[PDB]
Design an enzyme around this catalytic site. Structure first.
Site, PDB file in Angstrom:
ATOM      1  N   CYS A   7      21.245  47.028  45.891  1.00  7.81           N
ATOM      2  CA  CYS A   7      20.513  45.823  45.451  1.00  7.81           C
ATOM      3  C   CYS A   7      20.308  45.679  43.936  1.00  7.81           C
ATOM      4  CB  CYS A   7      19.166  45.693  46.230  1.00  7.81           C
ATOM      5  SG  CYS A   7      19.436  45.365  47.965  1.00  7.81           S
ATOM      6  N   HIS A  76      17.139  52.134  46.509  1.00 11.58           N
ATOM      7  CA  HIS A  76      17.247  50.729  46.209  1.00 11.58           C
ATOM      8  C   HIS A  76      16.773  50.468  44.756  1.00 11.58           C
ATOM      9  CE1 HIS A  76      17.608  50.332  50.559  1.00 11.58           C
ATOM     10  NE2 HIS A  76      17.861  49.041  50.420  1.00 11.58           N
TER      11      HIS A  76
END
Ligand code: NA
Length: 321
Positions: A7, A76
């Site tokens: 991400c 992430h």
């Protein structure tokens, strides 16, 4: 640093926005790893976009303002507080305005500053191929061609060592005990490789990183896009070596700052390091980084030797192997 996480595009949006940049999906698709939905370093990706938009890499200071944090949590990327913060540095913009008159307008409107004309353009990754502020540590290839994939089985079978780990694409190695680490489901050890070498992997005398990077626009681009593979696979592979072991990796030099730093950090950890281009290596930009004699000794690393070899390889002045 240089860790991969998922991400990264989302996490970069607010950083990019400090320079008026607003990436559409098609534009994001020109970033290797985006379309394939793979983890990456937000900084390496930022660097690449800094060059593409403004013709300068991060060592220019262009994004050095501690505006927006980039953190990794639970594998992430996000913008939770962190010591690694980035954003348009307006003081740097002003420092550069004399040399690049429309640069302040580029960073205000998120357009590309064409370093060859001085004019602004819509985003295209082919306009600014190299950062103009960076002293490239070695020569780059002018002519790249379509070659069939190199076979390094001959090369690896001749290294000193009994136990071998091949990371990435499958490779038969006549004469040795070969384990295979891959995303392919029949590998000895299976996992995503974009998040690095799994800690449960054993230790080996030889590790060969058999992973390639697509040439799209330029040797520089190819280099940049392979950097994360050097960090997550080649550098992490050093933790899975027996004393005296050997790590060999596919590479394209270190045209970009990250690759140079990562290769440096890998070289320090070995008695001997070299760069080779054997007869089996067809793709003009491809080389093998060869790290022999893994140990725990503190060392410095002069890049002159590898850099000179790289230049001689890429300009054609080094004898053919
Ligand atoms: Na060492």
């Amino acid at each position: 640093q240089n860790k991969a996480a998922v991400c990264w595009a989302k996490a970069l949006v607010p950083v990019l926005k400090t320079a008026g940049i607003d990436m559409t999906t098609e534009q994001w698709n020109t970033v290797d790893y985006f379309e394939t939905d793979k983890a990456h370093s937000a900084e390496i990706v930022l660097n690449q976009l800094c060059v593409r938009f403004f013709g300068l890499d991060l060592d220019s200071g262009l994004f050095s303002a501690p505006t927006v944090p980039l953190s990794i949590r639970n594998n992430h990327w996000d913008n939770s507080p962190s010591p690694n913060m980035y954003g348009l540095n307006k003081e740097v913009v002003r420092q550069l305005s004399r040399r690049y008159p429309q640069l302040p307008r580029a960073v205000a409107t998120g357009r590309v500053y064409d370093m060859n004309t001085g004019t602004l353009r819509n985003y295209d990754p082919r306009i600014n191929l190299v950062p103009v502020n960076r002293r490239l540590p070695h020569a780059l290839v002018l002519h790249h061609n379509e070659h069939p994939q190199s076979d390094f089985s001959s090369f690896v079978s001749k290294l000193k060592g009994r136990t071998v780990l091949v990371v990435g694409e499958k490779l038969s190695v006549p004469g040795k005990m070969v384990d295979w680490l891959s995303d392919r489901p029949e590998a000895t050890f299976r996992a995503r490789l974009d998040l690095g070498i799994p800690g449960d992997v054993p230790k080996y005398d030889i590790i060969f990183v058999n992973v390639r990077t697509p040439y799209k626009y330029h040797h520089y681009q190819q280099c940049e896009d392979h950097a994360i593979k050097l960090s997550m696979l080649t550098k992490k592979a050093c933790l899975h070596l027996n004393p005296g072991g050997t790590c060999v990796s596919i590479g394209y030099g270190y045209a970009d700052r990250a690759s140079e730093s990562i290769i440096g950090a890998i070289a320090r950890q070995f008695k001997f390091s070299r760069v080779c281009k054997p007869k089996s290596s067809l793709e003009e930009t491809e080389v093998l980084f060869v790290f022999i004699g893994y140990d725990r000794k503190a060392r410095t690393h002069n890049p002159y030797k590898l850099s000179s070899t790289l230049t001689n390889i890429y300009t054609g002045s080094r004898l053919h192997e």
